[PDB]
Design an enzyme around this catalytic site. Structure first.
Site, PDB file in Angstrom:
ATOM      1  N   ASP A 263       0.691  -1.137  -0.144  1.00  0.00           N
ATOM      2  CA  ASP A 263       0.235  -0.002   0.075  1.00  0.00           C
ATOM      3  C   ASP A 263       1.129   1.317  -0.267  1.00  0.00           C
ATOM      4  OD1 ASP A 263      -1.677   1.404   0.043  1.00  0.00           O
ATOM      5  OD2 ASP A 263      -2.356   1.439   2.172  1.00  0.00           O
TER       6      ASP A 263
ATOM      7  N   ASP B 129      -8.485  -3.225   1.725  1.00  0.00           N
ATOM      8  CA  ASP B 129      -8.558  -2.338   0.499  1.00  0.00           C
ATOM      9  C   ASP B 129      -9.263  -3.173  -0.169  1.00  0.00           C
ATOM     10  OD1 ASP B 129      -6.103  -0.416   1.470  1.00  0.00           O
ATOM     11  OD2 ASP B 129      -4.806  -1.959   0.634  1.00  0.00           O
TER      12      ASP B 129
ATOM     13  N   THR C 129      -4.493   4.724  -4.145  1.00  0.00           N
ATOM     14  CA  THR C 129      -3.405   5.288  -3.078  1.00  0.00           C
ATOM     15  C   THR C 129      -2.079   4.983  -3.347  1.00  0.00           C
ATOM     16  OG1 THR C 129      -4.313   3.781  -1.268  1.00  0.00           O
ATOM     17  CG2 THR C 129      -2.184   5.254  -0.839  1.00  0.00           C
TER      18      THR C 129
HETATM   19  N1  LIG Z   1      -6.028  -7.355 -13.091  1.00  0.00           N
HETATM   20  C1  LIG Z   1      -5.943  -6.466 -13.952  1.00  0.00           C
HETATM   21  N2  LIG Z   1      -5.487  -6.209 -14.991  1.00  0.00           N
HETATM   22  C2  LIG Z   1      -5.390  -4.497 -15.373  1.00  0.00           C
HETATM   23  N3  LIG Z   1      -5.213  -3.762 -14.611  1.00  0.00           N
HETATM   24  C3  LIG Z   1      -5.318  -4.215 -13.251  1.00  0.00           C
HETATM   25  C4  LIG Z   1      -5.802  -5.374 -12.659  1.00  0.00           C
HETATM   26  N4  LIG Z   1      -5.257  -5.111 -11.672  1.00  0.00           N
HETATM   27  C5  LIG Z   1      -4.686  -3.748 -11.273  1.00  0.00           C
HETATM   28  N5  LIG Z   1      -5.104  -3.382 -12.291  1.00  0.00           N
HETATM   29  C6  LIG Z   1      -4.778  -1.578 -12.497  1.00  0.00           C
HETATM   30  O1  LIG Z   1      -3.525  -1.694 -11.634  1.00  0.00           O
HETATM   31  C7  LIG Z   1      -3.520  -0.213 -10.935  1.00  0.00           C
HETATM   32  C8  LIG Z   1      -3.750  -0.308  -9.642  1.00  0.00           C
HETATM   33  O2  LIG Z   1      -3.768  -0.537  -8.779  1.00  0.00           O
HETATM   34  P1  LIG Z   1      -3.095  -2.108  -7.346  1.00  0.00           P
HETATM   35  O3  LIG Z   1      -2.319  -1.943  -6.711  1.00  0.00           O
HETATM   36  O4  LIG Z   1      -4.522  -2.336  -7.027  1.00  0.00           O
HETATM   37  O5  LIG Z   1      -4.000  -0.186  -6.701  1.00  0.00           O
HETATM   38  P2  LIG Z   1      -2.867   0.669  -6.002  1.00  0.00           P
HETATM   39  O6  LIG Z   1      -2.688   1.505  -6.567  1.00  0.00           O
HETATM   40  O7  LIG Z   1      -4.584   1.429  -4.423  1.00  0.00           O
HETATM   41  O8  LIG Z   1      -2.057  -0.087  -4.993  1.00  0.00           O
HETATM   42  C9  LIG Z   1      -5.190   0.202 -11.236  1.00  0.00           C
HETATM   43  O9  LIG Z   1      -5.211   1.350 -11.737  1.00  0.00           O
HETATM   44  C10 LIG Z   1      -5.617  -0.796 -12.295  1.00  0.00           C
HETATM   45  O10 LIG Z   1      -5.948  -0.311 -13.618  1.00  0.00           O
END
Ligand SMILES: Nc1ncnc2c1ncn2[C@@H]1O[C@H](COP(=O)(O)OP(=O)(O)O)[C@@H](O)[C@H]1O
Ligand SMILES: Nc1ncnc2c1ncn2[C@@H]1O[C@H](COP(=O)(O)OP(=O)(O)O)[C@@H](O)[C@H]1O
Ligand SMILES: Nc1ncnc2c1ncn2[C@@H]1O[C@H](COP(=O)(O)OP(=O)(O)O)[C@@H](O)[C@H]1O
Ligand SMILES: Nc1ncnc2c1ncn2[C@@H]1O[C@H](COP(=O)(O)OP(=O)(O)O)[C@@H](O)[C@H]1O
Ligand SMILES: Nc1ncnc2c1ncn2[C@@H]1O[C@H](COP(=O)(O)OP(=O)(O)O)[C@@H](O)[C@H]1O
Ligand SMILES: [Mg+2]
Ligand SMILES: [Mg+2]
Ligand SMILES: [Mg+2]
Ligand SMILES: [Mg+2]
Lengths: 48, 550, 520, 50, 191, 535
Positions: B65, B404, B98
């Site tokens: 995170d 989350d 985040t």
């Molecule tokens: N399976 C997936 N396929 C395509 N894009 C993804 C997938 N999982 C997450 N993302 C992309 O990754 C970005 C960040 O995801 P995540 O790391 O879960 O949130 P954060 O930025 O809060 O850590 C999101 O904007 C999302 O569009």
């Protein structure tokens, strides 16, 4: 950035001059003028 | 990038640190932003990878995170503290994006500093972003999609996989997506005359390293981490309609108030005073034992003087616990949390209406731990999450990851409208804003053009984390999206493009509806606004003044 | 300057290289601590004691490594010990190899650390399938097979020579703690130690063993049928929860205040004599005035007993934890006590409590250990925890997996055969799972002194044709089937080894950078 | 640009040929700009700043 | 450690031949070629060898230009003597110059009357000894009470040349290091 | 990126400056240097005390001498050290005015830097204003070349008294000004005149009072005779009034070659022969000098002893050890030439002098010769006295400044009338053209106008007069009347017309104040980055 751990953003000339610790006493008089401009009028603390 | 430190000036004497001005401040502020932006740039998306941070005592924390990794990074610089507190504001409000909101703010301060060097004022730059963002939120409303013609809970399952990804438990998302959706439907309640809301951190997390994450058991009910008072008590209460008594009253050798000083002339009164001082607590526990409370709950502990009758009457005791967990047990079982037992009349009593109801209660052993598992609540349903892993550091990673995932599905049910993910929003807002301000012309076309390029950093960051050809995907993304926006309203195929984009696993363009990539609309709403205010706070700084500590 | 970081950021590929080398280094310390011919390890703690053992868990408790990736490998032994209690060195030695085999690919063929994770879950799903198929059930009530099952883990320890006594010692102890599903717990298993004596005369005896003697000399040192009654409060005069503060005015008050101190202890003693107990065990201390009049009725007084032992006495004698003495009845009094006797040992006195032996609450017991020295006692005590841990899995799960590396080798063969039909990008990490599973027999051959080149080649040739129960004899170093060898282990230990080892690799493979010295 | 080296000898210049010669550069990547500036000064004699 | 270095360091080209039968040829001849090259440099530097009785116009060249030498910082030491025939110490110092000139041919030995050197020089301060090197005055020495006065000897003068950096400490020409053949003969017999 | 970030060596001592505030310290640093020497401008000036590290003390008011040999830290003040020096080397006057005028341009330029005009554009305004200012001064310039030598003789006193009036030598300005003028009469050619400054020597002795200073025609020597029994004063006899001064490079010594040599001395026959060789050499030596008929012989090096007595017998005094640089100057005044050797000595190459005498100075044990000439000779040597060591150095420097001021009159007869008259004349010329050529550079013309006004206001400030009435009177009067020789009267006379006050300045001197000031300030304004490596 003050002496202690507090941080503050400031556009107001009175609060800018208040937080700034000045060594020269004559320049320190402008802190009181901005305090006087802030107390009497409350507008244009940097124009004075 | 800054070298040759500023000279101590004799004409301007201020107490404390020296004053410095010019373009070096905005260069130092951007340099301070790259110190934190490069940290979170690698741990973005499913292909992204995270890092470890030691606590200087042997302990460490492997964190995905953005709020957690920046919380432990105590940034001494003032400009970095704005983004540190923004992530603490981001995760508490929405619990999603985040990492992206810090990456968006870093790219904005990069190009904003480049625009200040291009000799346009920051006030015109800020006006260009605000008019662009007002059109962006208007465009987000256009690309909404209402869930319809979906079989069962599939829309809640596949949208959780997007939040479940970028973690260690993304491979097990097929197993955790069901229980996560089933958990929030179990804690449903009513408030504000029909408005549906769910409580914060209602589902519990129990750290039991053991078998595996695949075999995580969904106990349909409430779980509590507490040790048994006396080991002679029974660990399994048979028979249905088990009554639960929630209290916050102490059952110990109680003491009189502060302002009481006993003074007696007769020696024989010590026998009655010593017995009545202990026996006054027996009047409280004799009434609840006769009420048939099979399992009593309390905040304050119970001394051994009162544990005899519970062992003799086969009643389960509970030691110290948190104050908030007993509130939800009373809501689920139907009991009422009593701060101090009393009655409106002039005599103390204990009513039967204060008792809860549940089907079964049992103390399950999670391989070293005593935890009272309650299941089959009558008034309101409940749920708990049994996390399992290889070691305690992975369980800590599973805590915030589920927090989350629970938060994303929480805001999903508040608003039925959703938006696709995978850089399609950023890719569409780029081309949409490039077409915008062509009629405006004179000055704000360059500011909004660089603003449109700032949102493209997210599909570029996801590509390099995969260690693949990034510009090959950027050529497909932007071009496809453009060919969709320009198109006639009447063109099914082209319109569809507006819907899809980057894929990080197979490395090709596929449909998000069939793939299942989806996000809430609320995650993007108020994310760019927070990044906008984050950019405004540093961009308007001209000079930096530092006062040394006393 | 900027925030407390950026000393030397280990980023890119070199960061993961140090973790694979650090994770491999943990297994190299206890590489020789596996198999029947395993060597012992004496670790020096900084306080002043000494830990003599070969268990990987007890070794890694005392060691301290200033590296964050190796500490995650350190915590895996607590996962195995506080889940079953056997195979802790098996967990540490397997994971090292999994991280090591996957490394070639990470370093060179550039497979991203997420594609390896997806390959391992399908290998984990197939590993449980073949481990379920290779295991054969076994009857739980067969004492002849249960003794051979318990001594499988004892064979890798020092007390294999006394294995005929340890299996009888562990089997009687497990059945005592076993409750009639079939849940048992080791918190009542008393680990009391007696330095000196011979292992042959050491035996389990039903009941408890105290470290204290009676207070008064006239107490009966030999009672036929003791009647135990547990007390929580002290027999001293309770001052009370509030100050008394008696305002004395007359001369006949102070002697009255000191006289009621004698009468209150008479009142609590006289109501104890309503049931006429023989042995009164108090949790807190006892007064000198109260013991005499308990002796007038025929009781026996002891010193303060910690309530960890009183809870065992409550299940042995059937009594209940009692604090209020006014509510003392005849039903809550302990009974069916076998014998009372006090032996003389130069260290301290020891009071014995025997049970009549003739459903209800589960019975407790105390296992007598008569070793050679202090370290021999702690060595043998950990062997009982490793031996009694085996007895729980057969009751919770009637399945029984083959030992001697035959189970893990069966995982190696099926994953290797199925890797050809799994054509794609997942084939390279999926095939590398078999390369590490064939190492846990390789370590046995290295400790035995044989050549693992031709033995493993002969193993794979006979494993597909001969049978699924083939394995390596650790003593002789030849291929001997587990059916004729007569040594078997539970299948639950094989599950935790495969699950914990693979799940540990999925965590550590996601590590990108290492930044040390941030804050407390 | 006003430069004053360690020996305390004033040297004012406009072209980048002698400004970079005065500042003794430690970094190799920053020495690339110094080498081309002296090479441009040696070959042509104009455009050392551009 | 010093036992290995004394084989080569503490033996000249004439003494290095003692170790021809004992030590290895490649170990010995490698150093003899080095010491032979050093001997050739001293022969090329031997531009002097008798006292240069000069006069003033010339001082501005002989004393100072020489001190620059090649100006490879080939410096040359130039010992000046403001002679005064009436003083007893001056005639003693003149004898030391000619004695040292025959030995140290690389160092320039200069002499001139003190009355002709400086306008109205104090006669009490004579004899005066100045040492130039690369145009700079290394030592402005006063009358020879520091060097024993009337009882000044050749050993004291050679020791002064080592202090100003004109001659090395371990030079074989110095009387302190140039042990007599009878002295070394007794050492070998008693060894 | 790591925690170390190094590009150049010693980043801790090197510190840059930038922006408007960095340039603000430079002009304000010039005010501190200007304000020190602001009081020393004009006839009412006050000197400055200087102390070297070695303990040597001197006092002066010349701006180049003040700023010289001073420990400085800032680089801009070191440029002002090189400024004043510039004016000194070439001109030798106006060293304080060019620094004050340069600071005045910088002070007026700061207001403009504060409005938003680029600094190079400000310097372009002063260039067009400076060329227009000097062009207007050349238009109203009067030439004194048409007059004869008699009236031109008087004009040298009007300018020599000006520069000497601003020093401590002005107690008798009529007396000491003749010394500065009479020295140049003896070197001028009277047609296409050149000063030939190298012939004019200058030496001062610490002793007596300044009133006893008298100009002589000859060379001053700081050394005694070869023997004290020789006569002090040497006069000529019946004919050939020139004393026939013979000058020599090689002294009275035995002949020998330069190279190293050893003369092989045989048995007693050769030993007795060489005694006759040198004894006949001295007899050949004294016959050679008496054949030439010389009366005074000087060599750069000392004669032998025996040689000191052999000259004393024939009434033939001698001086010995005459410096090599001092030996060449004696031959020029005496209309002689130095012989290389003694065989070439003849009558034509001998000298000529009126009289010589050995002058005593109190109880000190030193001797000085004073050569005098009755007729006009080539060279001339000053003879300065005073009651202190520094007052002689001040009189030497005050006379040197006046010697360089009159030097400009010889090479350039076109003179001006300063003292605030040229400044106010050049200030209103650019002001009248400012409102005609408004453009955007009008503020630069006004800044150049007000910068020129600081000089007469400084003279009014030092003289105690009101700058309001003084500046208003000059601006109002000079705008009305075309006569441009009215300035600030500092001595308190009743009339401000400088025709009667006897004050004249050169055109080349007043021009260089504006040129070196406006050309320096272009360099001062073009600095943006300021890196100072701490020692
Ligand atoms: N399976 C997936 N396929 C395509 N894009 C993804 C997938 N999982 C997450 N993302 C992309 O990754 C970005 C960040 O995801 P995540 O790391 O879960 O949130 P954060 O930025 O809060 O850590 C999101 O904007 C999302 O569009
Ligand atoms: N919209 C505007 N357009 C042009 N000038 C403005 C505008 N608003 C304010 N100003 C001018 O800028 C000045 C702002 O002063 P201000 O910053 O409010 O002083 P203070 O902050 O001390 O109260 C005012 O004096 C006004 O003349
Ligand atoms: N007699 C034996 N011969 C060959 N292999 C054995 C023998 N005993 C144990 N092993 C192997 O050693 C491994 C670990 O057994 P054990 O030593 O009991 O556990 P731990 O590693 O916890 O000490 C098992 O996986 C088993 O295959
Ligand atoms: N009169 C002019 N008009 C327009 N541009 C000019 C003029 N003179 C110079 N330049 C431009 O100024 C730039 C910088 O020139 P300059 O810095 O003086 O030369 P250098 O960089 O070789 O020292 C050049 O690229 C040139 O194009
Ligand atoms: N007696 C006088 N009457 C009027 N003006 C004078 C008089 N003496 C000097 N001045 C003026 O004062 C100025 C002083 O210059 P001065 O100080 O001698 O040169 P510097 O400034 O180089 O030391 C001269 O330029 C002259 O115009
Ligand atoms: Mg996320
Ligand atoms: Mg074992
Ligand atoms: Mg150019
Ligand atoms: Mg002057």
């Amino acid at each position: 950035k003050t002496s202690r751990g507090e941080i503050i953003i400031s556009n107001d000339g009175h609060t800018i001059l208040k937080q700034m610790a000045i060594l020269h006493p004559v320049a320190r008089m402008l802190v009181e003028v901005s305090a006087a401009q802030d107390s009497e009028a409350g507008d244009g603390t940097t124009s004075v | 990038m800054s070298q040759l430190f500023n000279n101590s000036r004799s004409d301007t004497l201020f107490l404390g640190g020296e004053k410095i001005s010019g373009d070096d401040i905005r260069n130092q502020n951007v340099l301070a932003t790259m110190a934190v932006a490069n940290v979170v740039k690698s741990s973005l998306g499913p292909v992204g990878l995270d890092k470890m941070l030691v606590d200087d005592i042997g302990d460490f924390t492997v964190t995905n995170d953005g709020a957690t990794i920046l919380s432990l990074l105590d940034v001494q610089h003032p400009a970095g503290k704005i983004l540190v507190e923004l992530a603490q504001q981001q995760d508490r409000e929405i619990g999603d994006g985040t990492t992206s909101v810090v990456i968006i703010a870093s790219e904005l301060l990069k190009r904003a500093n480049e625009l200040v060097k291009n000799k346009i004022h920051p006030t015109t730059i800020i006006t260009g972003f605000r008019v662009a963002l007002r059109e962006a939120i208007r465009f987000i409303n256009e690309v909404l999609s209402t869930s319809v013609d979906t079989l069962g809970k599939e829309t809640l399952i596949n949208i959780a996989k997007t939040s479940m990804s970028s973690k260690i438990i993304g491979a097990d998302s097929d197993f955790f997506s069901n229980m996560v959706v089933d958990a929030l439907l179990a804690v449903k309640t009513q408030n504000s005359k029909g408005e549906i809301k769910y409580p914060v951190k209602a589902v519990n997390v129990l750290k039991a390293h053991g078998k595996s994450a695949t075999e995580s058991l969904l106990v349909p009910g409430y779980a509590l981490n507490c040790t048994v008072a006396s080991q002679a008590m029974p660990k399994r209460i048979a028979g249905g309609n088990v009554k639960i008594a929630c209290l916050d009253l102490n059952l110990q050798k109680a003491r009189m108030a502060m302002g009481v000083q006993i003074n007696i002339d007769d020696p024989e009164q010590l026998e009655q005073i010593r017995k009545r001082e202990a026996g006054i607590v027996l009047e409280r526990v004799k009434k609840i034992i006769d009420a048939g409370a099979q399992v009593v709950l309390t905040t304050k502990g119970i001394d051994d003087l009162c544990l005899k009758e519970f062992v003799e009457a086969k009643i389960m005791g509970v030691r110290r616990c948190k104050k908030e967990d007993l509130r939800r047990i009373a809501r689920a079982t139907g009991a009422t949390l009593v701060s101090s037992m009393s009655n409106l009349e002039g005599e103390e009593t204990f009513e039967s209406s204060y008792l809860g109801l549940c089907d079964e209660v049992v103390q399950a052993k999670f391989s070293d731990d005593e935890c009272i598992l309650i299941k089959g609540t009558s008034k309101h349903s409940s749920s708990s999450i049994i996390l399992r892993g290889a070691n305690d550091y992975s369980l800590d990673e599973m805590e915030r990851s589920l927090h989350d995932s629970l938060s994303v599905v929480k805001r999903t049910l508040e608003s039925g409208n959703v938006v696709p993910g995978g850089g399609c929003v950023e890719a569409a807002l780029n081309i949409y804003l490039d077409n915008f301000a062509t009629t405006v012309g004179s000055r704000e076309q360059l500011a909004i053009a660089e603003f449109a390029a700032a949102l493209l950093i997210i599909p570029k960051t996801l590509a390099v984390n995969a260690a693949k050809d990034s510009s090959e995907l950027v050529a497909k993304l932007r071009s496809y999206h453009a060919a969709s926006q320009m198109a006639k309203p009447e063109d099914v195929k082209r319109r569809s493009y507006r819907n899809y984009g980057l894929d990080l696993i197979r490395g090709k363009i596929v449909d998000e509806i069939h793939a299942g990539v989806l996000e809430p609309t609320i995650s993007k709403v108020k994310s760019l606004k927070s990044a906008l205010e984050a950019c405004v706070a540093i961009l308007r700084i001209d000079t930096m003044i530092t006062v040394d500590p006393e | 300057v900027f925030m407390n970081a950026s000393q030397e950021r280990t980023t890119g590929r070199q960061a993961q290289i140090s973790n694979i080398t650090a994770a491999k280094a943990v297994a190299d310390v206890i590489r020789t601590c596996l198999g029947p011919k395993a060597m012992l390890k004496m670790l020096l703690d900084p306080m002043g004691g000494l830990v003599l053992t070969n268990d990987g868990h007890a070794i890694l408790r005392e060691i301290d490594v200033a590296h964050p990736a190796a500490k995650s490998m350190l915590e895996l032994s607590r996962t195995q010990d506080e889940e079953v209690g056997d195979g802790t060195t098996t967990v540490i030695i397997l994971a090292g190899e999994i991280l090591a085999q996957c490394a070639p690919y990470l370093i060179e063929k550039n497979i991203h650390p997420v594609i390896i994770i997806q390959a391992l879950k399908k290998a984990l799903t197939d590993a449980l399938e073949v481990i379920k198929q290779v295991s054969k059930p076994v009857d739980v009530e067969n004492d002849a097979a249960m003794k051979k099952l318990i001594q499988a883990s004892i064979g890798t320890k020092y007390v294999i020579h006394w294995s005929e006594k340890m299996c009888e010692l562990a089997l009687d102890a497990v059945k005592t703690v076993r409750k009639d599903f079939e849940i048992d717990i080791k918190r009542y298993v008393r680990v009391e130690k007696i330095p000196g004596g011979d292992v042959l005369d050491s035996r389990v005896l039903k009941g408890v063993l105290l470290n204290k003697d009676v207070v008064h000399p006239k107490m009966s040192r030999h009672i036929e049928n003791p009647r135990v009654v547990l007390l929580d409060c002290p027999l001293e005069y309770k001052k009370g929860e509030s100050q008394t503060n008696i305002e004395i005015e007359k001369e006949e008050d102070w002697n009255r205040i000191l006289q009621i101190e004698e009468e209150q202890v008479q009142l609590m003693c006289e109501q104890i004599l309503a049931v006429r107990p023989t042995l009164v065990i108090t949790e807190k201390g006892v007064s000198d005035l109260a013991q005499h009049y308990l002796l007038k009725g025929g009781c026996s007084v002891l010193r303060r007993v910690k309530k960890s032992d009183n809870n065992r006495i409550a299940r042995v004698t059937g009594a209940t934890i009692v604090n209020r003495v006014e509510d003392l009845k005849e039903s809550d009094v302990g009974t069916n006590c076998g014998l009372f006797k006090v032996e003389m040992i130069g260290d301290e006195y020891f009071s014995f409590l025997d049970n009549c032996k003739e459903s209800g609450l589960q019975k407790a017991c105390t296992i007598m250990l008569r070793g050679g020295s202090k370290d021999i006692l702690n060595e043998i005590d950990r062997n009982l925890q490793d031996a009694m841990a085996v007895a729980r899995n057969v009751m919770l799960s009637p399945s029984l997996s083959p030992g001697g590396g035959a189970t893990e080798m069966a995982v190696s063969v099926k994953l290797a055969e199925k890797a050809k039909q799994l054509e794609g990008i997942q084939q390279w990490p999926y095939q590398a799972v078999a390369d590490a599973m064939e190492c846990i027999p390789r370590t046995l051959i290295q400790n035995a002194g044989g050549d693992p080149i031709r033995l493993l080649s002969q193993l794979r040739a006979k494993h597909a044709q001969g049978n699924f129960t083939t394995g390596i004899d650790g003593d002789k170093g030849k291929i001997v089937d587990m059916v004729s060898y007569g040594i078997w282990e539970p299948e639950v230990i094989k599950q935790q080894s495969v699950k914990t080892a693979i799940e540990s690799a999925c965590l550590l493979l996601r590590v990108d950078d290492i930044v040390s010295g941030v804050r407390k | 640009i006003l430069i004053v080296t360690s020996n305390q000898k004033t040297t004012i210049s406009n072209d980048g040929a002698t400004i970079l010669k005065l500042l003794d550069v430690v970094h190799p990547a920053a020495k690339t700009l110094v080498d081309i500036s002296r090479a441009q000064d040696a070959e042509v004699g104009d455009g050392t700043t551009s | 450690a010093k036992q290995h270095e004394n084989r080569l360091e503490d033996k000249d080209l004439s003494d290095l031949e003692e170790l021809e039968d004992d030590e290895d040829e490649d170990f010995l001849e490698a150093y003899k070629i080095k010491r032979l090259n050093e001997i050739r440099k001293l022969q090329e530097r031997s531009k002097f060898g008798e006292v240069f009785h000069i006069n003033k116009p010339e001082y501005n060249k002989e004393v100072t230009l020489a001190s620059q030498g090649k100006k490879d910082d080939g410096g040359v030491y130039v010992f000046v003597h403001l002679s005064l025939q009436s003083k007893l110490q001056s005639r003693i110092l003149s004898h030391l110059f000619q004695s040292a000139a025959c030995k140290f041919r690389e160092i320039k030995f200069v002499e001139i009357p003190a009355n002709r050197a400086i306008e109205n020089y104090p006669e009490s301060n004579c004899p005066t000894l100045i040492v130039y090197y690369r145009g700079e005055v290394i030592k402005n020495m006063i009358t020879l009470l520091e060097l024993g006065g009337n009882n000044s000897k050749m050993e004291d003068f050679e020791d002064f040349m080592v202090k100003v950096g004109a001659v090395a400490e371990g030079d074989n020409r110095l009387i302190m290091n140039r042990d007599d053949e009878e002295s070394r003969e007794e050492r070998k017999l008693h060894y | 990126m790591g925690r170390p970030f190094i590009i150049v060596k010693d980043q801790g001592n090197k510190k840059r400056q930038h922006g408007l505030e960095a340039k603000k310290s430079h002009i304000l640093a010039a005010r501190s240097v200007a304000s020190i020497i602001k009081t020393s401008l004009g006839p009412r000036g006050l000197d400055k005390i200087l102390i070297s590290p070695d303990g040597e003390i001197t006092i002066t008011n010349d701006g180049a001498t003040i700023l010289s040999q001073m420990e400085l830290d800032n680089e801009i003040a070191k440029l002002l050290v090189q400024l004043s020096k510039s004016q000194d080397d070439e001109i030798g006057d106006g060293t304080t005015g060019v620094v004050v005028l340069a600071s005045a341009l910088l002070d007026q330029a700061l207001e403009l830097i504060q409005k938003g005009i680029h600094p190079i554009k400000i310097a372009n305004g002063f260039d067009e204003a400076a060329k227009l200012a000097i062009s207007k001064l050349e238009e109203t310039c009067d030439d004194i070349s048409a007059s004869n030598d008699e009236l031109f003789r008087d004009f040298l006193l009007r300018a020599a008294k000006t520069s000497l009036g601003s020093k401590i030598v002005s107690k008798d300005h009529d007396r000491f000004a003749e010394m500065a003028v009479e020295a140049v009469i003896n070197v001028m050619d009277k047609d296409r005149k050149d000063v030939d400054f190298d012939l004019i020597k200058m030496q001062g002795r610490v002793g007596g009072s300044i009133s006893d200073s008298k100009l002589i025609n000859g060379v001053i020597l700081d050394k005694d005779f070869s023997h004290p029994q020789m006569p002090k004063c040497v006069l000529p006899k019946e004919g050939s009034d020139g004393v026939k001064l013979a000058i020599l490079t090689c002294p009275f010594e035995p002949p020998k070659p330069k190279t190293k040599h050893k003369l092989d001395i045989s048995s007693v026959e050769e030993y007795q022969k060489l005694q006759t060789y040198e004894q006949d050499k001295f007899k050949e030596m004294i016959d050679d000098v008496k054949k030439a008929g010389a009366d005074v012989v000087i060599c750069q090096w000392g004669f032998d002893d025996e040689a000191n007595h052999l000259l004393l017998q024939n009434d033939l005094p001698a001086v010995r050890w005459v410096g090599g640089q001092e030996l060449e100057h004696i031959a020029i005044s005496t209309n002689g030439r130095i012989v290389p050797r003694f065989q070439d000595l003849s009558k034509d190459k001998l000298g000529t002098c009126s009289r010589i005498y050995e002058q005593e100075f109190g109880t000190t044990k030193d001797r000085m010769l004073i050569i005098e000439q009755s007729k006009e000779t080539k060279t001339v040597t000053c003879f300065v006295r005073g009651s202190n060591k520094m007052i002689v150095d001040e009189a030497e420097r005050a006379l040197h400044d006046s010697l360089c001021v009159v030097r400009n009159l010889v090479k350039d007869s076109r003179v001006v009338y300063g003292g605030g008259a040229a400044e106010v004349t050049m200030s209103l010329a650019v002001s009248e053209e400012a409102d005609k050529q408004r453009g955007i550079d009008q503020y630069a013309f006004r800044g150049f106008a007000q910068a020129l006004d600081t000089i007469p206001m400084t003279l009014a400030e030092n003289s105690g007069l009101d700058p309001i009435g003084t500046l208003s009177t000059l601006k109002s009067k000079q705008l009305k009347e075309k006569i441009s020789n009215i300035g600030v009267d500092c001595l308190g006379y009743g009339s401000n017309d400088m025709k009667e006050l006897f004050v004249v300045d050169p055109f080349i001197g007043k021009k260089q104040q504006i040129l070196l000031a406006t050309q320096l300030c272009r360099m001062i304004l073009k600095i943006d980055n300021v890196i100072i490596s701490g020692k």
